[PDB]
Design brief:
This protein is of the alpha/beta class and 197 residues long. The protein is built from 5 helices and 11 strands; from the N terminus they run ββαββββαββββαααβ. A hairpin with a 2-residue loop joins strand 3 and strand 4. It is globular, with a radius of gyration of 17 Å. It binds the ligand CC1(C)C(=O)N[C@](C)(Cc2cn(-c3ccccc3)nn2)C1=O and zinc ion (2 copies).
Length: 197
């Protein structure tokens, strides 16, 4: 009757957030973003994106780590797979590209849980946790994974981002602030048995 996955959390103070050079967005605007999505859809079909959910606690209060692009949009660490690239190897590659250390020591990323799937039916902002009616060729498939952190780690944050620890209550019913994926993380994380180490 214990059917829940057990996840170890560690205090935010166990982690060191260093700095490294800016990591520039491939798209300089929303219009460039959907232009490139259109171009690549014609060459290699549906975009495949992967996102990592990294959890910490402070005083037993779970927090999700978010990347804030300056003081603008909040992002999960992640990004686009190459054609034929494994989803889990790819999320590990991307999380290394974003948060990997300047001394080039490897993080031991542990990824054992899928926490959801989102689909983009058009070259437009809307995303859904299912393929909408009549949609045969979704333009993007986004996969979210829970990333189990080690007890301690050094992360190097690109200088153009802030790493922010968001408490679940701040995400919950806050789509305007965070959008539909991040704002549904409280619900999607509720099934886990978190251990507060
Ligand atoms: C922009 C574009 C295409 C992308 O989405 N993924 C790559 C290929 C690599 C990357 C991942 N990030 C990033 C993602 C989330 C938070 C912070 C940084 N910025 N670049 C890109 O460059
Ligand atoms: Zn405490
Ligand atoms: Zn799909």
């Amino acid at each position: 009757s214990m059917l829940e996955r057990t996840i170890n959390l560690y205090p935010l103070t166990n982690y060191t957030f260093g700095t490294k050079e800016p990591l520039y967005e491939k798209d300089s605007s929303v219009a460039a973003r959907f232009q490139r999505m259109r171009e690549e859809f014609d060459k290699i079909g549906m975009r495949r994106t992967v996102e990592g959910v990294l959890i910490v606690h402070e005083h037993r209060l779970p927090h999700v780590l978010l990347l804030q692009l300056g003081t603008t949009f909040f992002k999960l660490p992640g990004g686009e797979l190459n054609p034929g690239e494994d989803e889990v190897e790819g999320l590990k590659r991307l999380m290394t590209e974003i948060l990997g250390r300047q001394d080039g020591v490897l993080q031991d990323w542990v990824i054992d849980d899928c926490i959801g799937n989102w689909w983009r039916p058009n070259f437009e902002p809307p995303q859904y946790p299912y393929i909408p009616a009549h949609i045969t060729k979704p333009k993007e498939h986004k996969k979210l994974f829970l990333v189990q952190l080690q007890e301690k780690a050094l992360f190097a944050v690109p200088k153009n981002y802030k790493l922010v620890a968001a408490p679940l209550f701040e995400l919950y019913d806050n789509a305007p602030g965070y959008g539909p994926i991040i704002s549904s993380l409280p619900q999607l994380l509720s099934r886990f048995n978190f251990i507060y180490n």
